[PDB]
Amino acid sequence: TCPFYKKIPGTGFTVDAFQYGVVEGCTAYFLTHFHSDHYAGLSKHFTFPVYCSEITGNLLKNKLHVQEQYIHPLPLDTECIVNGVKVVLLDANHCPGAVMILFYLPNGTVILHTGDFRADPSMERSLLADQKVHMLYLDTTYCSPEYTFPSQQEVIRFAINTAFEAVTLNPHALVVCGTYSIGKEKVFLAIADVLGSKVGMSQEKYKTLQCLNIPEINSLITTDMCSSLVHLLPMMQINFKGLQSHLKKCGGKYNQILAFRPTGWTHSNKFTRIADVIPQTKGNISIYGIPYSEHSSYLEMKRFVQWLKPQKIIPTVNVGTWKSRSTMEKYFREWKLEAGY
Numbered sequence: 001t002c003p004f005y006k007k008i009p010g011t012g013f014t015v016d017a018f019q020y021g022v023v024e025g026c027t028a029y030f031l032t033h034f035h036s037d038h039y040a041g042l043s044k045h046f047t048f049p050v051y052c053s054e055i056t057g058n059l060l061k062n063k064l065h066v067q068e069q070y071i072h073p074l075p076l077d078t079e080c081i082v083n084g085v086k087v088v089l090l091d092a093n094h095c096p097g098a099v100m101i102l103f104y105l106p107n108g109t110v111i112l113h114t115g116d117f118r119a120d121p122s123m124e125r126s127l128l129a130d131q132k133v134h135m136l137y138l139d140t141t142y143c144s145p146e147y148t149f150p151s152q153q154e155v156i157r158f159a160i161n162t163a164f165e166a167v168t169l170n171p172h173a174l175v176v177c178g179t180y181s182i183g184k185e186k187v188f189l190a191i192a193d194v195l196g197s198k199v200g201m202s203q204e205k206y207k208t209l210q211c212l213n214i215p216e217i218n219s220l221i222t223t224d225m226c227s228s229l230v231h232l233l234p235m236m237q238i239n240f241k242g243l244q245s246h247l248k249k250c251g252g253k254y255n256q257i258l259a260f261r262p263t264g265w266t267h268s269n270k271f272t273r274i275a276d277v278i279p280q281t282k283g284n285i286s287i288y289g290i291p292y293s294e295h296s297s298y299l300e301m302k303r304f305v306q307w308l309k310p311q312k313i314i315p316t317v318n319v320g321t322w323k324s325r326s327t328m329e330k331y332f333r334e335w336k337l338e339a340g341y
């Protein structure tokens with residue numbers, strides 16, 4: 001049944017709750033972003049109001065065929081009224097179109113639901129600075145001190161320098177980047193920009209990117225693989241067998257692959273700096289696992305929460321085991337005693 005951490009008290013609303021059938025008493029279903037564990041359940045047969053960003057609404061219409069009459073896109077950073085309740089959508093710094101949702105309950109309680117997010121100090125200067133938040137529904141994906149990772153900027157500098165050096169040493173090398181969802185577009189787009197190429201991809205993936213309002217996108221992507229030396233493939237195909245097979249398909253245009261897998265975290269982060277990352281190599285194929293995250297590190301999460309000073313935290317991730325729940329609650333208490341709220 002629908003878990004409590006998906007329901008907004010004092011309203012008829014749910015967040016990211018499309019796989020439970022008709023949730024009894026729900027008048028408005030919000031969707032924070034277009035990732036499958038969150039939209040699971042939506043289709044052209046859904047007939048209740050969906051509230052979301054413009055970009056998420058484009059993806060609902062074009063990829064899932066949800067009918068337009070049930071899609072209610074909202075502008076960001078703007079006070080809107082939904083079924084009698086004031087709400088605001090804020091940028092979550094996750095994937096394109098991903099939002100956090102502020103709810104102003106009729107009784108005076110203010111609730112922030114982060115959806116999935118990568119906390120950032122810029123958020124301390126949004127509409128969040130303007131009133132107190134009582135209850136925080138928090139993306140706790142990486143809520144343990146072992147999870148450190150570099151800035152997105154550091155990771156993209158590493159990827160651009162590596163790709164440019166490889167292709168300038170060997171003009172017959174192909175660059176391949178893995179994907180299985182929206183998000184992390186800066187990885188492949190930055191590499192294509194330094195090489196003077198478009199990114200080549202499947203018709204399905206091209207359609208997805210064309211829903212994202214990214215400026216000048218017609219100038220950066222293409223379905224013509226032959227004209228491109230940066231190819232996007234499914235993440236599953238980013239292994240030696242999959243890559244050797246792809247190289248066969250290019251008809252001797254290329255003699256080497258350099259491949260990137262933008263993972264979240266991997267335990268090479270508890271030891272290794274970004275400067276010190278090395279690939280797995282077999283023959284003329286090299287694979288680089290790079291720690292490009294669209295979720296908060298532990299320290300980013302901790303800073304955001306100690307700034308916001310909520311009265312109550314409701315985790316939304318890692319909630320399925322008692323040891324994970326109890327560990328997170330211990331961190332929340334440490335943070336509150338350190339900061340004095």
Ligand code: NI
Nearest residue numbers: 033035094116
């Ligand atoms: Ni997500």
